[PDB]
Design a protein around this motif. Structure first.
Motif, short mmCIF file in Angstrom:
data_model
loop_
_atom_site.label_atom_id
_atom_site.label_comp_id
_atom_site.label_asym_id
_atom_site.label_seq_id
_atom_site.Cartn_x
_atom_site.Cartn_y
_atom_site.Cartn_z
N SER B 6 0.72 -1.20 -0.12
CA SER B 6 0.04 -0.17 -0.13
C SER B 6 0.90 1.18 -0.01
O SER B 6 2.21 1.30 0.37
N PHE B 7 0.52 2.43 -0.32
CA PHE B 7 1.04 3.69 -0.12
C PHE B 7 1.64 3.90 1.27
O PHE B 7 2.60 4.64 1.40
N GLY B 8 1.06 3.56 2.11
CA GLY B 8 1.46 3.90 3.66
C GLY B 8 2.79 2.85 3.72
O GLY B 8 3.70 3.47 4.30
N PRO B 63 0.99 13.79 -5.30
CA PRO B 63 0.59 12.27 -5.16
C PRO B 63 -0.64 12.22 -6.06
O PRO B 63 -1.74 13.18 -5.79
N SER B 64 -1.00 11.59 -6.62
CA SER B 64 -2.31 11.30 -7.47
C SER B 64 -3.39 10.60 -6.50
O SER B 64 -2.96 9.67 -5.55
N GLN B 65 -4.57 10.59 -6.53
CA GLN B 65 -5.61 9.80 -5.86
C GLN B 65 -5.31 8.35 -6.27
O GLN B 65 -5.46 7.56 -5.31
N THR B 66 -5.18 8.01 -7.35
CA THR B 66 -5.18 6.59 -7.72
C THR B 66 -3.91 5.84 -7.08
O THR B 66 -3.69 4.99 -6.33
N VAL B 68 -2.38 7.15 -4.27
CA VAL B 68 -2.56 6.92 -2.79
C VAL B 68 -3.52 5.83 -2.49
O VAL B 68 -3.08 5.16 -1.34
N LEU B 69 -4.42 5.49 -3.50
CA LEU B 69 -5.26 4.10 -3.34
C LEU B 69 -4.71 3.11 -3.62
O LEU B 69 -5.13 2.03 -3.27
N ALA B 70 -3.53 3.20 -4.25
CA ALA B 70 -3.14 1.94 -5.15
C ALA B 70 -2.55 0.94 -4.06
O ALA B 70 -2.13 1.19 -3.01
N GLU B 71 -2.16 -0.20 -4.53
CA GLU B 71 -1.63 -1.19 -3.72
C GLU B 71 -0.77 -2.10 -4.57
O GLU B 71 -0.51 -2.94 -4.49
#
Lengths: 88, 77, 94, 96
Positions: B6-8, B63-66, B68-71
């Motif tokens: 994940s982004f985290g 950072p794009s939204q995709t 940030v949400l992507a994995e």
């Protein structure tokens, strides 16, 4: 452990909850995640005429104190901050 | 065992000094890296995340939204 | 009575104005095709998403939102990167 | 010799503010409720200078492109991420 990382906040958003940074200059701002609605269309929600119309994917919104909703642009501090929390 | 991140997790990788990339990215030879305050330098610099692009240029990363949400994040090795 | 194209280059600013006049824009440098930006106003979004009609005090309404259509036939909210913003390879979708 | 010009009170779009930033001037949105905030651009060569990296001697060496920073109210300099209302706004002005 009192406040969260952006990654954890992402996880909370992905669960469907709202999230905000205390560091934000204001109150009643928060993020939420609208998951993909394929029914959203230029011809009105649920009234799409073409089967290959583009589909809205997930969108993160920021609701502002103005009671307005905008698409969220994650700032660098936002993604590196550690002052994320759940709205309740 | 998890196959991508994940982004985290990617951010944690970044904070350790490593380079990260998304598999779903269109471009090749593309990655992020984190530059600390001190090497950047009463205004005090923060950390800055940089994206390096295939054109061999470096830009502050937005950072794009995709993204940030992507994995599909990964370490550049 | 119809104009002629003086320049190849288009900045973000010019692209922006075109967007605000309800027109679509994209960048030559982008990897990918059939990708473009569009802008939806508060009212257009209330109609497209079925929410945000402003009949309730304390019910939020959509602002203006710039989206990007990607090659996946997907729409996402557009993040204005430093590169996009500084670029001067913008072109109008025609 | 040279007469002074008048300030007109008009504010400009982000497109215009960008060109200004590209001329090397600083900008700021009135709509930002905070004060002492402004964007500024740093060019490729100024960046190779100021971090000491990217002067082009090596092929696979990368160069810093242009970068918009923002000096914050809190006296911090960060790479600037434009919000969408930032982009659509028309309360931009040059810093005097």
């Amino acid at each position: 452990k009192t406040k969260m990382s952006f990654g954890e906040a992402l996880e909370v958003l992905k669960q469907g909850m709202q999230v905000y940074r205390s560091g934000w200059n204001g109150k009643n701002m928060f993020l939420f995640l609208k998951s993909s609605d394929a029914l959203a269309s230029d011809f009105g929600f649920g009234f799409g005429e073409y089967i290959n119309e583009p589909v809205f994917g997930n969108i993160i919104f920021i609701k502002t104190a103005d009671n307005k909703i905008h698409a969220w642009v994650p700032s660098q501090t936002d993604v590196l901050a550690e002052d994320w929390d759940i709205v309740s």
